[PDB]
Amino acid sequence: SIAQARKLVEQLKMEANIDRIKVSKAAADLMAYCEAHAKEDPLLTPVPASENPFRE
Amino acid sequence: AAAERSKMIDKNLREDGEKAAREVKLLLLGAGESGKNTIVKQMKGIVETHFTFKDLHFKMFDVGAQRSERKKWIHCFEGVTAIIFCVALSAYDLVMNRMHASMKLFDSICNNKWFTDTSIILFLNKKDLFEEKITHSPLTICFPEYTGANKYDEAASYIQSKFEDLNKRKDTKEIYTHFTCSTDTKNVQFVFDAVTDVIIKNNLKDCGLF
Amino acid sequence: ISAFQAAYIGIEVLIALVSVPGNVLVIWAVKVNQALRDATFCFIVSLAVADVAVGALVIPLAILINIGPQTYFHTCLMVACPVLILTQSSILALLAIAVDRYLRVKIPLRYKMVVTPRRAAVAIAGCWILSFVVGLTPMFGWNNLSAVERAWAANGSMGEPVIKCEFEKVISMEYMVYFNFFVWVLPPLLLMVLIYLEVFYLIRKQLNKKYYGKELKIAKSLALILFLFALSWLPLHILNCITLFCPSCHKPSILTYIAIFLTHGNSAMNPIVYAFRIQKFRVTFLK
Amino acid sequence: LDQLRQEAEQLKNQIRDARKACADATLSQITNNIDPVGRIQMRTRRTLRGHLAKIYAMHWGTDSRLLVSASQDGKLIIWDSYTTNKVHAIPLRSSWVMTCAYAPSGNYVACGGLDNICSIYNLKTNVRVSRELAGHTGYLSCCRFLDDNQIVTSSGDTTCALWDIETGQQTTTFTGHTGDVMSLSLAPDTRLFVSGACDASAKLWDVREGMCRQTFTGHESDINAICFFPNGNAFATGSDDATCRLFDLRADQELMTYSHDNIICGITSVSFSKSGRLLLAGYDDFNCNVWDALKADRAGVLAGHDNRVSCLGVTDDGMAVATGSWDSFLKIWN
Ligand SMILES: Nc1ncnc2c1ncn2[C@@H]1O[C@H](CO)[C@@H](O)[C@H]1O
């Protein structure tokens, strides 16, 4: 039962050795994406009636 | 035109959608090794069995093959007309008891959030194998609290009362108990009678009479 | 204008103000939900639009006729005949529900395939066109045009007659007794009791085939339905009868008034008895 | 055998410490300075009528015009959403379907469910079955096209698998979940995907090496839904515990929780808007809630159904949200 169970540890070993980035850099990248693409979001900033395909 | 294609396809939808709405759909639930197979032999992943009896088309879905958790796919069968539950009477001593495991399975489907209004057809199986093996062993092995004569008539009526009284929704759903026979006509006829009673009572609840 | 008449008005006003909100609430709950678009809810919303029309138009028209403003004759026919059309439509809608509830127990397996909601609409439209003919029959020449022009000519005037308009003055009683009551009110009442007696046998037979309480509750539901219909329409129609066959039979005035509001009262009790009993309908109102 | 497993638990302790080590700030205080968006009022622009049973899945085509929906009536309907026209109605061999997918070329759809079979249908032949991919041992819960040739599937048997459609074989299997997999989401670059399971964990998978790079925990119950943030460096999960959570791949931990005390029902579906600013989530309470993904305040509600919202999706161009429901209707919103 140990030999089948042991294989999870090598996966956990793979997860253990990776480099992690700080939340301050990670969270900054998400807000940077949102601000840069605000103009291409028709749900965030509503579009005029004529431009809107479903209800022109 | 494109709206002509939309209207032709919509005609086939309404045509096929009423042809498949006059068919009784029956979820079949049982325990492992509980005698589900003998019922399906008489009437002819998820397995669909289609039979027609007395101008009623019955679709019976044996979903016991699924080893996945029940809570993730049991809401697909919310619209089934009735639930056929098969219990092996002979398995009251076999294996934590097998009859105690079937009673907890029954108490989950009957008191479910989706099956509040769906009637349960209860089948008790192997009444001949139950009748002979009941003298070498009492029901005190299975049900200790039993105080009755150890004969087939009293013992079967107590097991049926244990299974029935797990119905907390006594007003909206009903358990129809039939002991299965070896003759093919009798078991299918009971299924048709139980389905007929539930369909009539479903019609009565839409008037406001029931 | 009179003590009895004033009392009748106030009763009519509250009958209207209880008939219009309850019935529009039936129509509202039908239109907002999509689980109430089968065959039997078509008949119920047919009854609902009939009875809200009663509380909307029939009650003000009935009040105006009672007060008797002086009116030309053909103008009073177009006022008095919408009372006949709308009230009749209520009766025929009630009959249509009973045939629907009879088919649920006579042919319960093939019910959905036989009375399909398309066929529901032709029967509903059939009820309404039969409602309009019976109401417009006075305008086609079955009225007191004959009798009134003799009385008009006697005092000397000529032209078109102007009368204090009252329902007994413009609508002949041989129409009301022989055509409204004996053909279009009394056979619907007798078809209802034959349908519901037959329904009770089939329901009782199935139950016998904890059960005594449900059977008595079903009998109480059917009895209440038949009694409320027979308490509404029957007294007014009998009063018309004993005014035709016994011309000299004197009856008090407030008796005639009290009969009329009972007829209107049926349109108020309809949603309580018919739609509020269905479980699916009740829960979308509570929620 | 016991001491070896705690040694794995010893690895878990440093992983928690390592994740804690890089939590230098919170997403909420970093995004504290920006003005909140305020109320968003999407109205239903279309009601797609024609299904006759519960709708269990839908998927937009990549042209943002066609969409496919799957229902328990055994019909796969392709809708031209602009005109409400039905383009195709595909009759299903098994009606117990739980998932559908639209191929990015538009030439194929996929569908499957309790039949344990993923059926591929060629739309440009009428529509006919081109392949039935067999091999899962539980219900097919989700499926997504990498391209026309390849399709990733998830299954109740606790595995996911990548299939080569031409040969019909599993080319790589993805094992490591300890509960039935409920949902998967392809990365925008399609080299990675995430899966969500009933073991309350999400796992990021590498397609070409075929094993789990990272596992994200934090949920206390089943994950029913999962969706990548549009840049592929984060994702959101939806759970039966009434919370959504945003997880970052590079920070390898939870960044934000989206929940209210007045929502206690399960989440059935999640999706991001085009810019990533809005996280829309479908709930058992018949409503869809629109969350501001940067600040976690609820921005709006979409209340137009009489039963559970079982599926939703945002168009590739971002122009619209479709919601599908157990009450048999789809609605298009913007
Ligand atoms: N004798 C009557 N006097 C006044 N109105 C009447 C009379 N008989 C019937 N009606 C009217 O006819 C309708 C029934 O057809 C009732 O609403 C009632 O107002």
Side-chain angles (χ1 to χ4, degrees), chain C residues 8 12 54 58-59 62 65 80 83-85 87-88 91 166-168 173 175-176 180 185 233 236-237 239-240 243 251 256 259-261 263-264:
Chain C
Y8 164 95
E12 288 299 333
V54 170
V58 168
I59 312 309
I65 292 179
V83 168
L84 292 180
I85 308 191
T87 52
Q88 175 61 0
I91 289 176
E166 293 224 0
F167 206 96
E168 292 93 2
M173 291 294 104
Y175 156 90
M176 294 300 293
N180 211 1
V185 173
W233 306 89
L236 182 43
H237 283 104
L239 287 192
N240 298 344
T243 302
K251 61 180 180 295
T256 305
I260 300 178
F261 82 76
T263 282
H264 297 164

Side-chain angles (χ1 to χ4, degrees), chain D residues 45-62:
Chain D
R45 312 289 181 195
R46 303 276 189 276
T47 299
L48 306 185
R49 310 178 183 267
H51 280 305
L52 296 172
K54 294 178 188 179
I55 297 166
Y56 267 75
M58 63 84 51
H59 198 216
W60 282 101
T62 192

